[PDB]
């Protein structure tokens, strides 16, 4: 399953960010919510103007987020991962997500 | 002393409600505080949503900023 | 070597048992040699 | 093997507080609080409030 | 410096919220406090049980009434096993999925069932292998079937159990 | 919080450290960073650094010319406030001697201290991942549960007897 890096993300730290992104020539809308007690980011994925999000999950490092969901016509077939740029023991935080902040959220697409 | 030093005496700056870092609130009840007040023994009190000094009354009776 | 702890526990239980059930008066003996009074001994004060 | 002790502590601690209440009541000074929230005066205090 | 597992009872839950009384306006009135305390303390119980709903479902502490559910998902049925050893078999079979039956490997799996010095293994020239037990804490006949499974296809095994050396 | 190589306040060379811990260091405290940021800003004469003609201080305007003390103080006091993290300037004793033609001023600057936002790029981690158990403790219990109970019993037997 050859895959190539094709997109990177950044977060400003606002607890209720929402924006639209284009992946594999298809367009999706994303929502990020910050959880206080669990100090983690909650990601919701869905179609543009959809009534409810298609997928909701909790973000973690080195875990394939989309693994159990590559069976729907509206879910990207690529790979979405979070891995750190600094010390390997650093876990995902609020302000430490970005191309140079410490954690590299990235999307990669299979070659077809 | 940290609350009065850098303050010219001519301004007449009262010491009533200033906050003193380092001190701890006085935990005595209402009756105890009234007793200490008659003694001219000032107390640092934890106030509504905060903590602050009470009064700059010296032993003789006159307010400190006057002295 | 938890047998050592179990040992001390075994007779500590007995000391406690006699203290609780020390008839009207019993004088349990601690390892320090001091003397512990039964509950009913401690109750003489009210007993007047 | 003897790890039933996982139940013994809920009694050992409790007897500790009971001994504490015993001590304060017997050797108190001119009080004690039971689990019911009611007060038990120490002897050196009970001797004061009674009918003379 | 901090625990990674954030699932814990909230420290001092009750005094919080009371901290949101604006300026001690009601404090010391003994009529509003009781009304607020009675309501808040109900959440205490629910907040506490939120943990056991997650803590107790782990295989380490799962009770037999629900441990069967964990085993059922993995295909390991209770059969006649009892709770203390039913936990063991679940661990043993699951651990077998990343094993190769080497001498160093076999010692590791037996290590979790008999402490540090409770087990030893002799080896023989013609496929002979021996297992020695010194500090068994559970009955072994029911555990025996698994002890065969994590061995090479052609092992020749003897089992002897005793208390102490 | 601007990070950069640490400059020794005493010599001007890089602060390789004491002979017992020789190495290289980064300026971490805001005080140290601001010190060198002002030092370099004042030490480089205007226009003398290639790759940036606008950096530096124009000493040539004043040195060697008959100048008014008041004008110089304004420029000295203005260059300081170009840093975005300067709170205020406390005092300023500008004095000039006509015999030796020397000029020497004194002043201090106040700056606060901030937080580190993230430790990912610096050294350590703040979490406390658990430790795996040892031997058959997990499947059969632990002895410490006995030791702690024995100690509690012993201390309680100690408490009741007066001492």
Q: CA F32, CA F7: separation in Å to the nearest integer?
A: 9
Question: Given the structure tokens 């108190």, which residue do they identify?
Answer: D28
Q: Does the beta-carbon distance from F138 to E112 stay under 8 Å? A: yes
Query: What's the N-to-C CA distance of chain D in angstroms?
Result: 60
Distance CA A40, CA A60 (A): 8
Q: How far apart are CA F84 and CA E117, in angstroms?
A: 66
Is the separation of the CB atoms in A93 and A103 below 8 Å? yes
Reduced to 3 states, what is the DSSP secondary structure of residue D45?
A: helix
Alpha carbon distance A75, A66 (integer Å): 8
Kindly provide the b/e burial profile for residues A56-70, where b requires at least 16 CB atoms within 10 angstroms of the residue's own CB: ebebeeeeebbeeee
Longest dimension (CA), chain D: 60
Q: What share of chain D is helix, strand, coil (3-state, %, to 5)?
A: 60, 10, 35
Distance between CA atoms of E121 and E134, rounded to whole angstroms? 12
- Say how far apart CA A98 and CA A87 lie, in whole Å: 15
Cα(F58)–Cα(D18) distance, rounded to whole angstroms?
83
Candidates F116, F148, F88; CA nearest to F2 is F116
Q: F112 to each of A101, F27, F42, F118, how far by Cα in Å?
A: 23, 15, 21, 19
- The torsion region of residue E118 among left (phi > 0), alpha (psi -120 to 50) and beta comes to alpha
Task: Report how far residue F106's alpha carbon sits from residue E6's, in angstroms, rounded to the nearest whole number.
Answer: 53
CA D44, CA E14: separation in Å to the nearest integer? 36
Q: State the smallest CA–CA distance between residue F150 and chain C in angstroms.
A: 6
CA quadruple C41, C43, C44, C47: dihedral positive or negative? negative
- CA angle at A64 for the pair A50 and A75, rounded to the nearest 5°: 25
Mutate to test the interface with C, among F157, F159, F160 (most CBs of C within 10 A): F157
Residues E103, E104, E109, E110: what is their CA dihedral angle, to the nearest 10 degrees?
A: 70
Q: What is the resolution of this structure in A?
A: 12.7
Tokens of D23: 């001590």
The torsion angles phi and psi of E19, rounded to 5 degrees, stand at -65, -15
Q: Do A89 and F121 touch (CB under 8 A)?
A: no
CA angle F115, F123, A14 (to 5 degrees): 40
Backbone dihedral region of E164: left (phi > 0), alpha (psi from -120 to 50 degrees) or beta? left
Please provide the DSSP assignment of F72-92 as one string.
HHHHHHHHHTTSTT--EEEEE
Neighbours of C48 (CB within 10 A): 4
Which of A34, A36, A37, A41 should we substitute to test contact with E (largest number of E Cβ atoms within 10 Å)? A37
CA angle at A17 for the pair A13 and A19, rounded to the nearest 5° = 130
Residue found under tokens 């973690």: A60
Of the partner residues F154, F160, F161, the one whose CB lies closest to the CB of residue C8 = F154
Report the gap between the CA of C6 and the closest CA in chain D (Å): 9
Chain E interface includes B11 (CB < 8 A): no
- The secondary structure of residue F127, as a DSSP letter, is B
- Phi then psi for residue F69, to 5 deg, are -55, -40
Cα D25 from Cα D42, distance rounded (Å):
4
Q: Are F114 and F30 in contact (CB under 8 A)?
A: yes
Find, among B12, B31, B25, the residue nearest to B51 by Cα: B25
Burial of D21 (0-12, 13-18, 19+ CB in 10 A): middle
Cα→Cα distances A80→A3, A68, A107, E158, Å: 11, 12, 5, 51
Tokens of E24: 């001690």
Cβ atoms of residues F157 and D15 within 8 Å: no
Strands annotated E in A15-99: 16-23, 26-35, 40-46, 55-58, 79-84
Give, for E40, the enclosing helix (H) or strand (E): helix E32-55
Nearest-CA distance A91 → chain E (Å): 10
CA distances from E139 to A94, C7, E82, E84, E165 (A): 51, 27, 10, 10, 18
Task: Please tell me what DSSP assigns to residue B57.
Answer: B
Q: How far is B60 from chain E (nearest CA, A)?
A: 33
Residue whose entry in the numeric block shows the structure tokens 């005595």: B28
Show the tokens assigned to D27: 């050797």
State the number of CA atoms in the 13 A half-sphere of E75 facing the CB: 2
Pairing assessment for the beta strands F88-96 and F103-110 based on DSSP bridges: antiparallel
Residue F105 · residue F73 · CB < 8 Å: yes
H/E stretch holding A110: strand A103-110
C-alpha distances out from residue C28 to C24, C44, D35, F54, F103, Å: 13, 17, 28, 92, 90
Chains D and A are touching, with contact defined as 3 or more CB–CB pairs separated by less than 8 Å: no
Contacts of D43 in chain C (CB under 8 A): 45-46
Q: Are B47 and B55 in contact (CB under 8 A)?
A: no
Contact flag for B and D (3+ C-beta pairs < 8 Å):
no
Q: Burial level of C25, CB count in 10 A (0-12/13-18/19+)?
A: exposed
Give the side-chain half-sphere CA count within 13 A for A35.
13
């Amino acid at each position: 399953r050859t895959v190539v890096r094709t997109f990177d993300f950044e977060l400003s730290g606002y607890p209720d960010e929402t924006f639209r992104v284009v992946l594999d020539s298809v367009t999706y809308e994303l929502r990020f919510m910050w959880n206080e007690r669990d100090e983690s980011w909650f990601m919701s994925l869905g179609d543009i103007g959809a009534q409810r999000p298609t997928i909701t999950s909790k973000l973690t490092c080195y875990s394939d987020i989309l693994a159990p969901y590559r069976y729907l016509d509206n879910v990207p077939d690529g790979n979405l991962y979070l891995w750190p740029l600094g010390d390997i023991r650093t876990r995902a935080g609020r302000f430490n997500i970005g191309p140079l902040k410490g954690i590299q959220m990235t999307y990669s697409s299979l070659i077809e | 002393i940290g609350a009065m030093a850098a303050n010219d005496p001519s301004y007449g700056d009262s010491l009533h409600l200033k906050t003193m870092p380092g001190m701890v609130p006085f935990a005595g009840s209402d009756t105890q505080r009234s007793n200490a007040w008659s003694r001219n023994a000032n107390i640092y009190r934890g106030l509504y949503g905060g903590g602050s000094y009470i009064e700059g009354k010296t032993s003789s009776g006159q307010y400190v900023d006057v002295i | 070597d938890a047998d050592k702890a179990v040992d001390q526990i075994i007779e500590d239980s007995k000391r406690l048992h006699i203290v609780v059930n020390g008839t009207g008066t019993e004088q349990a003996v601690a390892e320090d040699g001091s003397l512990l009074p039964s509950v009913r001994k401690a109750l003489i004060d009210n007993l007047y | 093997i003897a790890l039933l002790s996982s139940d013994a502590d809920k009694a050992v601690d409790q007897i500790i507080e009971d001994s504490k209440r015993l001590h304060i009541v017997v050797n108190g000074t001119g009080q004690a609080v039971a689990e019911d929230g009611s007060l038990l005066p120490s002897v050196r205090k009970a001797l004061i409030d009674n009918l003379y | 410096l901090k625990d990674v597992n954030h699932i814990h009872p909230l420290p001092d839950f009750v005094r919080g919220g009371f901290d949101y009384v604006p300026s001690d306006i009601f404090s010391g009135k003994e009529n509003f406090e009781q009304t607020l305390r009675i309501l808040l303390e109900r959440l205490e119980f629910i907040d506490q049980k939120m943990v056991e709903l997650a803590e107790l479902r782990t295989t380490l502490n799962a009770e037999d009434a629900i441990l069967d559910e964990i085993g059922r998902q993995l295909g390991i049925y209770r059969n006649g096993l009892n709770d203390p050893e039913y936990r063991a078999v679940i661990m043993i079979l699951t651990g077998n999925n990343s094993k190769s039956g080497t001498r160093a490997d076999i010692i590791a799996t037996l290590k979790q069932l008999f402490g540090e010095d409770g087990v030893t293994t002799y080896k023989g020239y013609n496929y002979r292998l021996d297992i020695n037990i010194f500090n068994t804490c559970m009955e072994v006949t029911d555990i025996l079937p698994e002890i065969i499974d994590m061995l090479p296809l052609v092992t020749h095994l003897r089992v002897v159990e005793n208390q102490g050396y | 919080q601007f990070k950069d190589l640490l400059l020794d306040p005493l010599t001007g060379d890089l602060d390789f450290g004491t002979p017992g811990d020789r190495g290289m260091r980064l300026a971490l405290t805001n005080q140290l960073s601001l010190r060198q940021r002002l030092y370099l800003r004042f030490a480089i004469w205007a226009g003398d650094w290639y790759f940036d003609e606008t950096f530096g201080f124009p000493y040539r305007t004043f040195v060697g010319k008959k100048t008014v003390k008041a004008v110089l103080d304004g420029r000295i006091k203005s260059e300081v406030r170009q840093e975005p993290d300067v709170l205020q300037i406390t005092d300023f004793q500008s004095t000039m001697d006509v015999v030796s033609r020397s000029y020497k001023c004194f002043f201090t600057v106040v700056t606060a201290e901030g937080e580190e936002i993230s430790l990912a790029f610096v050294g350590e981690d703040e979490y406390q991942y658990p430790t795996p158990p040892e031997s058959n403790v997990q499947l059969c219990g632990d002895e410490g549960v006995i030791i702690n109970f024995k100690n509690k019993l012993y201390y309680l037997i100690n408490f009741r007897l007066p001492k």
